[PDB]
């Protein structure tokens, strides 16, 4: 009802800056409090650096739920959004 099927998803496919910041904050918070790390780490200790490194690889298990003005919403997986 409220959800929109994957085939007719119309919103912009790119990743808005605000989505970028929210995703980075959430991931860093999760990692920084004993969460699994989906990608290898070489020498970087900061959770937030780890977060951007993970994003750059498109390896984030987060689904953005975009609310349209009416109330209907569509969902995008972070794996499928074109990041600048």
Q: Binding to other proteins by residue 72, rule CB under 8 A?
A: no
Strand partners, 64: 76
**Can you spell out the DSSP letters for 5-26?**
-GGG--S-SB--HHHHHHHHHH
Per-residue binder mask for other proteins (CB under 8 A), 24-63, x = binder: -x--------------------------------------
Return the closest-CA partner of residue 41 out of 25, 29, 59, 24: 59
Of 20-28, 35-43, 48-56, the window that binds other proteins (rule: CB under 8 A) is: 20-28
Q: Quick one: which of 6, 68, 79, 80 contacts other proteins (CB under 8 A)?
A: 68
Opening angle at CA 78, ends 4 and 23, nearest 5: 115
Binding site for other proteins (CB under 8 A): 11-12, 18, 21-22, 25, 66-70
């Amino acid at each position: 009802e409220l959800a929109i099927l994957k085939e007719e998803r119309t919103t912009t496919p790119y990743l808005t800056k605000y989505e970028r910041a929210r995703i980075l904050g959430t991931r860093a918070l999760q990692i920084s409090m004993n969460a699994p790390v989906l990608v290898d780490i070489e020498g970087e200790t900061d959770p937030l650096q780890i977060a951007m490194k993970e994003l750059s690889q498109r390896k984030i298990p987060l689904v953005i739920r975009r609310y349209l003005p009416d109330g209907s919403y569509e969902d995008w997986g972070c794996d499928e959004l074109i990041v600048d």
